[PDB]
Design a protein around this ligand. Structure first.
Ligand SMILES: NC(=O)c1ccc[n+]([C@@H]2O[C@H](COP(=O)([O-])OP(=O)(O)OC[C@H]3O[C@@H](n4cnc5c(N)ncnc54)[C@H](O)[C@@H]3O)[C@@H](O)[C@H]2O)c1
Ligand SMILES: NC(=O)c1ccc[n+]([C@@H]2O[C@H](COP(=O)([O-])OP(=O)(O)OC[C@H]3O[C@@H](n4cnc5c(N)ncnc54)[C@H](O)[C@@H]3O)[C@@H](O)[C@H]2O)c1
Ligand SMILES: [Zn+2]
Ligand SMILES: [Zn+2]
Lengths: 257, 258
């Protein structure tokens, strides 16, 4: 945990963020010495380190080239995760200018990433929202769906935020039943992924069909169907955990059929 | 979401919460009819259903018997999870009376559990803190530690909050490395469990010893060692994630060594 003024001798990867945006001059995550980005004398937070290079967060906005961290998703996974960290932390501090409990103004910790209240005894820590995402397998088929919320002509797997007081398993069961009306069996954890859009922690699952006919919630899904492994529609981009689930499923179907 | 004024014959379980506590008359969860608990004409929120009977949340404090939700942990998993949800929800609403962005007074969503601002478009959802917990295996042995944080003579597994921007995997490797100074491999997710103290979600993991020696920070642990599976010390009570992890680990050892 390092929170200080930037000197000429400071260098590395610079996450310059404001309101869920980051500064991408030339579509690049800023790299190099501080003076080369006019950051000398600017307050900054070291949010990590990638291959010897410190990753910094600067809470300011520029005039041009502000955009989504999704633009730099083709970088090393660890570096992308660190940039996402920058964006999330800036949005956290911005989200806690005032105390939710008593309405007084808050101030940063110096121990950790946290916002402490001057008046009352309350704290906040950056919010990570756990999410489930599951690829459901049926024999030689996988269930894929088009999403109502944002339309893209891409078919993908099922996802949803975990609720308070429920386990990941219950969250998969609940989300799947709510969206498609079917029941699954043989839940299988695969991996997890930080998804700063805005603040989700993905937990990825494989599952098999159990029973029920596909009955969709139109507020969430435009349509959903069983697609055989060999003849697939349009998939989410590689680099996302969704495509990865889809393709573990597919590779498995091929290998087994 | 459902949110109503309580009438004479409303019935079921009553999570009466305020400040990380719930009303536990004579040390049990209030069950029965509204009139029996003076809850008539009060705003309640249906937070779930258990065996047909609704589980309600009332945001008030009684003068006596306000305790920890862990006092009902040994009632079943579902009911305890719902009490946890009630307490956590109460804390959430209390934590978002004012908006952290602008400072104005927020309003509750009618469709979901959320706090909304009419001044700026921002909003908040209940905060769940992802937390890894890991049973580290080394052949027939499993790593057990004693915490300084609470000193009761119970040897349990390692755990730690997941950081912003890190995977569960990275979190396990990290916490293990900081607390014990050993490296792990072959992580296997076991299960998850909500843990309302105040508001975390445990992800239980098993790991195999890769390399390193036990070097601890005393700020976290009083001691830490390798215990063979059939010769265990005192463990956490049955009903916690920790004991499940340890028992499953021992079962695994049982499966590979006898
Ligand atoms: N491959 C991937 O990494 C991948 C794939 C798919 C979805 N995601 C992410 O998983 C999340 C889930 O997406 P979605 O399908 O539900 O659509 P979504 O992003 O629109 O969110 C769904 C709804 O749930 C609610 N919600 C938001 N935050 C919440 C919270 N913290 N707790 C409870 N409810 C909340 C909101 O009403 C939101 O409308 C999104 O961030 C999406 O960005 C990642
Ligand atoms: N059997 C079980 O289920 C079991 C077992 C062991 C520990 N736990 C729980 O796991 C949780 C965390 O593990 P712990 O023992 O290290 O907790 P801890 O509170 O003892 O230590 C974590 C530290 O990080 C801080 N912190 C609090 N919330 C945070 C957040 N959302 N993000 C980042 N930092 C935060 C805390 O102030 C604390 O100082 C605890 O709630 C604990 O009760 C459960
Ligand atoms: Zn306050
Ligand atoms: Zn506001």
């Amino acid at each position: 945990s390092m929170d200080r003024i930037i000197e000429k001798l400071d260098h590395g990867w610079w996450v310059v963020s404001h309101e869920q945006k980051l500064w991408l001059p030339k579509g690049e995550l800023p790299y190099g010495e501080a003076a080369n980005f006019d950051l000398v004398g600017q307050r900054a937070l070291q949010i990590g380190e990638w291959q010897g290079e410190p990753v910094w967060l600067v809470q300011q906005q520029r005039r041009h080239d502000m955009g989504s961290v999704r633009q730099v998703i083709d970088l090393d996974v660890g570096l992308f995760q660190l940039a996402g960290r920058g964006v999330q932390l800036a949005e956290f501090y911005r989200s806690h200018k005032y105390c939710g409990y008593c309405g007084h103004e808050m101030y940063p910790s110096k121990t950790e990433w946290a916002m402490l209240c001057s008046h009352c005894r309350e704290r906040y820590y950056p919010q990570i929202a756990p999410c489930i995402i599951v690829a459901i397998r049926r024999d030689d088929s996988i269930l894929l769906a088009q999403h109502t919320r944002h339309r893209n002509g891409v078919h993908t797997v099922l996802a949803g935020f975990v609720e308070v007081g429920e386990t990941l398993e219950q969250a998969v069961a609940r989300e799947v039943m709510e969206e498609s009306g079917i029941k699954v069996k043989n839940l299988r954890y695969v991996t997890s992924q930080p998804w700063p859009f805005p603040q989700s922690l993905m937990t990825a699952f494989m599952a098999e069909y159990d029973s029920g006919d596909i009955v969709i919630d139109p507020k969430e899904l435009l349509e959903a169907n069983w697609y055989r492994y060999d003849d697939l529609p349009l998939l989410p981009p590689p680099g996302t955990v969704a495509r990865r689930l889809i393709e573990d499923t597919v590779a498995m179907c091929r290998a087994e059929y």
